Design a protein around this nucleic acid. Structure first.
Ligand code: MG
Length: 801
RNA sequence: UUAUCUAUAA
């Protein structure tokens, strides 16, 4: 129900000077006065509400507001530094924008900043005081810029193509820490739609240099693709803003709507004819479809050539792989560069001269908060083979030179299925690919003996299943099927569907480009995946170098939900460790309500995993460590309540007497906390990021509760994101050190690479499982749940790697 | 689909 208090502060690891993008706030101990606004109409967007309030204050300066500078959240909440002269009697006013709005205002409450001050000093926090402050800090930026969630953006020019742009901006949030309010400031970038004529948008989306080419009506594929892009976007009439709900199938010349004549009789009129009569405009592109806008009942159709994409619309739909890359490149920058850009932003913002921030007596320090971090020692990684070598991670990285798998699978029989045309992937490549792959495999401790028992070409996803059917029936003890692919193909989804859910055969895909040109590291990394799919153990944590939680049987869980890019379900995935290393993880997966973050059927999934744990280890875990992927800030209270109880329920419906301690940990990567090295000698790599294993549980952390930051990974590009961990529940009474080290060591058990990853393997695996479930669904609730279900032989292994 | 990190999420 309520999160546990911080048990202690960590002492493990060597100290390191850090700077966080948290700026200390000096806040008065006054009382803010909270007024409620009811504006009619009641569903105008926040910007309209803000200008209504802006004009309202200036208009009623004489008798109401005077010299005061109130702040406003854009909805119903308005705050003042000192009380307005109306006591508590509601007041009805009328505001005029260039049209009329009835605005009532009644005093509702006071917000004590003193109540916050001591909430920051024991007294185990008022969310409403934090919200009031938040409204003060972001009142001026809300008028000045384009707000998006907790961020602000403006147009600077930076195209991603396909009618999209990169706008730069910043995140802003007011955050509690011990003995201070903090202002979290980070630079940000996000995708926006270009403000352009829809015609040009059609060109960029359909790759037209000129609308003049394509002088004919769109194909069906052209049309609906254009539909998916513009659908839901707002357009404006050059001639009034509208919401596009659909694109017509018919061209403007033949698309019709019911038009009532003066006789009262309605007749079907074409869009082209209507615009010719009513607006005296002859359509230049009548062969193109129309935009359906507003309520569908209204039959409102707009020609493309009279519409512009409305400025300031953030792109939410998934970017193409190239759009993503261009965005990554344009936004990525080293830790020092980011640290400087934040500084510039602080100078530029200049919060101390902000009238509203001044009005409420607030002050913001221009220096980044100094924080002492602790670089935890990494675990040793025990390999096997003849050598039994131990790897010592350096900078969150290690390798397999002169090392062999803990338990390497001795592969004897295996097949190859190449879906690339031999025109590009001749038998030359396959046999050299095989030769190089085996030498690396020999060295890896997972030796592939003998040439592949089977190697054929094939094409089309239509041929996967029968080809796979053939293989399992004709080759005894067939261990692996190496599939080769061209590029992005639906064959992949089919290969995984048949392989994971139907026949239960281990399949390893690889692209044609990688087939042609093989490097040892790429091959070695490919062997990492292959070995675990066949039930091998690449490596394990050094058993003696483990936290004491492993003293008694324990299961490690990872949970996450992947959401669709309407009417498609979200997919919940929960993985569970099946041994004491811990290496092997069993997956559970559930389809559920569209965009529901809460794992509905979690109790059944935990039950299932506890059974499998017992079946694998003959032990019932005395402790359940639950790493839950990040959740929306309101949803924390919702998630904790349903899912913590679901976990308890699983234990009880298993046995009345079964009651293991649960540790519920939310792991967040989606925040804007950035940590920088104070001393340049501590910078790692070209990106100059903090070293792997850096842990912060002081200064910027929660005043009462048990949370910490842990940057477990090496920062390769841009600025690192230290994963935030928040313990919402802990029966096991973990110390700070043991939990932090446990978490850090679990980040070294990720089998797809010999590096410490940014989150613990369980959480990462959960994401892989949920993501793999999408591909299983590519081909009605009963059917979907079934299509997601994995083959029971496959369920043993980590097929998702 | 070798892999981590990385910016979003009328
Ligand atoms: Mg998630």
């Amino acid at each position: 129900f309520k999160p546990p208090p911080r048990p202690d502060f960590g002492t493990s690891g060597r100290t390191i000077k850090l700077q966080a993008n948290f700026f200390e706030m000096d806040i008065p101990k006054i009382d803010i006065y909270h007024y409620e606004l009811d504006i009619k109409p009641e569903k105008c967007p926040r910007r309209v509400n803000r200008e209504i309030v802006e004009h309202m204050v200036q208009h009623f300066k004489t008798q109401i507001f005077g010299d005061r500078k109130p702040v406003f959240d854009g909805r119903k909440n308005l705050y003042t530094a000192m009380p307005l002269p109306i006591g508590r009697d509601k007041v009805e006013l009328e505001v005029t924008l260039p049209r009329i709005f009835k605005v009532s205002i009644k005093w509702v409450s006071c917000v004590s900043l003193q109540a916050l001050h001591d909430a920051l000093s024991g007294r185990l926090v008022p969310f409403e005081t934090i919200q009031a402050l938040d409204v003060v800090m972001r009142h001026l930026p809300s008028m000045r810029y384009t707000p998006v969630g907790r961020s602000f953006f403006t147009a600077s020019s930076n195209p991603l193509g396909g009618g999209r742009e990169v706008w730069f901006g910043f995140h802003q949030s007011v955050r509690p820490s011990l003995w201070k309010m903090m202002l979290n400031i980070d630079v940000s970038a996000t995708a926006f739609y270009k403000a352009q004529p829809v015609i040009e948008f059609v060109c960029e989306v359909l790759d037209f240099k000129s609308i003049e080419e394509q002088q004919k009506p769109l194909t069906d594929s052209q049309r609906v693709k254009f539909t998916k892009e513009i659908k839901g976007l707002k357009v404006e009439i050059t001639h009034r803003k509208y919401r596009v709900c659909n694109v017509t199938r018919r061209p403007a010349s033949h698309q019709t709507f019911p038009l009532q004549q003066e006789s009262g009789q309605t007749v079907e009129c074409t869009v082209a004819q209507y615009f010719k009569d009513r607006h005296k405009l002859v359509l230049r592109y009548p062969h193109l479809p129309c935009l359906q806008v507003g309520q569908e009942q209204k039959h409102t159709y707009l020609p493309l050539e009279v519409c512009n994409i409305v400025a300031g619309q953030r792109c939410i739909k998934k970017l193409t792989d190239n759009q993503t890359s261009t965005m990554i490149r344009a936004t990525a920058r080293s830790a020092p560069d980011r640290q400087e850009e934040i500084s510039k932003l602080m100078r530029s913002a200049d919060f101390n001269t902000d009238p509203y921030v001044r009005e409420f007596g607030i002050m913001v320090k221009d220096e980044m908060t100094d924080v002492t971090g602790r670089v935890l020692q990494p675990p040793s990684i025990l390999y096997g083979g003849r050598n039994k070598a131990i790897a010592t991670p350096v900078q969150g990285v290690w390798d397999m030179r002169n090392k062999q798998f803990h338990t390497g699978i001795e592969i004897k029989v295996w097949a190859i299925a190449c879906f690339a045309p031999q025109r590009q992937c001749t038998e030359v490549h396959l046999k050299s690919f095989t030769e190089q792959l085996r030498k690396i495999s020999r060295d890896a401790g997972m030796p592939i003996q003998g040439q592949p028992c089977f190697c054929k070409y094939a094409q089309g996803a239509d041929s996967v299943e029968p080809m796979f059917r053939h293989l399992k029936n004709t080759y005894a003890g067939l261990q692996l099927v190496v599939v080769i692919l061209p590029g992005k193909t639906p064959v992949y989804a089919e290969v995984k569907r048949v392989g994971d859910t139907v026949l239960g055969m281990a399949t390893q895909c690889v692209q044609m480009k990688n087939v042609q040109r093989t490097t040892p590291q790429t091959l070695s990394n490919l062997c990492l995946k292959i070995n675990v799919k066949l039930g091998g153990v690449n490596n394990i944590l050094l058993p003696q170098g483990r936290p004491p939680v492993f003293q008694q049987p324990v299961i490690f869980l990872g949970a996450d939900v992947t959401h669709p890019p309407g009417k498609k379900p979200s997919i919940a995935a929960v993985v569970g460790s099946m041994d004491a290393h811990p290496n092997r993880y069993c997956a559970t997966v559930r389809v559920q309500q569209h965009r529901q973050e809460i794992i509905q059927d979690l109790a059944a999934m935990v039950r299932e995993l506890l059974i499998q744990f017992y079946k694998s280890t003959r032990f019932k875990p005395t402790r359940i460590i639950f790493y839950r992927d990040g959740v929306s800030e309101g949803q924390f209270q919702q998630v904790l309540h349903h899912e913590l109880l679901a976990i308890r329920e699983a234990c009880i419906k298993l046995e009345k007497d079964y009651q293991p301690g649960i540790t519920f940990i939310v792991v967040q990567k989606r925040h804007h906390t950035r940590l920088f090295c104070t001393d340049k000698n501590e910078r790692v790599g070209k990106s100059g990021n903090i070293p792997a294993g850096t842990t912060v549980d002081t200064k910027i952390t929660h005043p009462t509760e048990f949370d910490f930051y842990l940057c477990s990974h090496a920062g390769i590009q841009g600025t690192s994101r230290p994963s935030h961990y928040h313990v919402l529940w802990d029966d096991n009474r973990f110390s700070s050190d043991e939990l932090q080290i446990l978490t850090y060591q679990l980040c070294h058990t990720y089998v797809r690479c010999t590096r410490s990853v940014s989150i613990p393997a369980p959480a990462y695996y959960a994401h892989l499982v949920a993501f793999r479930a999408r591909y299983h669904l590519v081909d009605d609730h009963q059917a979907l749940a079934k299509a997601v279900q994995v083959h029971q032989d496959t369920l043993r292994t980590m097929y998702f790697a």
